[PDB]
Design a protein around this nucleic acid. Structure first.
Ligand code: MG
Ligand code: MG
Ligand code: ZN
Ligand code: ZN
Ligand code: ZN
Ligand code: ZN
Lengths: 162, 162
DNA sequence: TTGACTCTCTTAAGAGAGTCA
DNA sequence: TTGACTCTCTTAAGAGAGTCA
């Protein structure tokens, strides 16, 4: 809602509901050849999802609360950060999933940062492979690797230099 | 349609024209605190751009050639790879700017890979900072670094465990 | 045959708000 | 009030195709 006490109340009910989502253990690469364990609190695959939650997309949900007879709605992963600035250097802050598991709503697996910072974690070597993110990664990004480039830089003539 | 020989001719005329674009010297980070030099062949900011070139968007261009009365058009950065496979692992190949300078059309600064591989280079530590791309980056990604996260993983209660 | 404009679309990380019951 | 659906938009790396003289 608008007041501090009202925002805290929204975060508390959200945490309580999400706290009852089934907990699934995920073993993940940490980088450096090491492996770790994450406990994700996953929103159900189909309705009902939990008090206040509704699906607006294949893997998108929203949390709804009616405060003073007026309904308020937020992206399901954004609630933990309702008291933080919604922007940073003119860029919109976004709920970034450290566990790379969209169904997970564990706030201990989420951070609040620019979309660019958010995306970049997909290629991070991980907490044990060189991660330099100030708010450390929980695991190596799923896209980290040598890649599969079909063709590299090349020229037929001699008009260019690197 | 166009024979192998005709495609080669299109690549040759494209190189001839791009080679005459202003050549700008840029000093860039390579990772490991090292600085390097990259020479970008930059398409003009406004028309005319060069023979065969036209702007279809703020930072998008196309290359056009008419062969035997039929007009052919390609994304401006895609020409170097016309004789290469156009997909890999079920993913479309895209022109990936190793120099991270959109206006540049220097073929020695481009590679052909998936959009995910392409995007990830934005966060790479660089050829001198740990790059593991099989087709090595020319410089450290512009977005590499500690990031600027506003809020980290947190909970108000004790419903969660990482 | 060309140049200089016009328009909408793809991905995969993220969002907004409306219609019914 | 609360649930279960519907639709489209944003970002920044990338695209294809039409009009007119
Ligand atoms: Mg993410
Ligand atoms: Mg790129
Ligand atoms: Zn999780
Ligand atoms: Zn990281
Ligand atoms: Zn360049
Ligand atoms: Zn690299």
């Amino acid at each position: 809602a608008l007041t501090n006490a009202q925002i805290l109340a929204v975060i508390d009910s959200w945490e309580e509901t999400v706290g009852q989502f089934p907990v699934i253990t995920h073993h993940v690469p940490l980088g450096g050849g090491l492996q770790g364990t994450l406990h994700c609190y996953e929103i159900p695959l189909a309705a009902p999802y939990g008090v206040g939650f509704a699906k607006n997309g294949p893997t998108r949900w929203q949390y709804k609360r009616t405060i003073n007879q007026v309904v308020h709605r937020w992206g399901s992963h954004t609630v933990p950060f309702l008291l933080e600035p919604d922007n940073i250097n003119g860029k919109t802050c976004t709920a970034s999933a450290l566990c790379h598991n969209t169904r997970c709503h564990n706030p201990l697996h989420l951070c609040w940062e620019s979309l660019d910072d958010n995306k970049g974690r997909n290629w991070c070597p991980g907490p044990n492979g060189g991660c330099v993110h100030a708010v450390v990664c929980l695991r190596q990004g799923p896209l980290y690797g040598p890649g599969a480039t079909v063709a590299g830089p090349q020229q037929r003539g001699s008009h260019f230099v690197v």
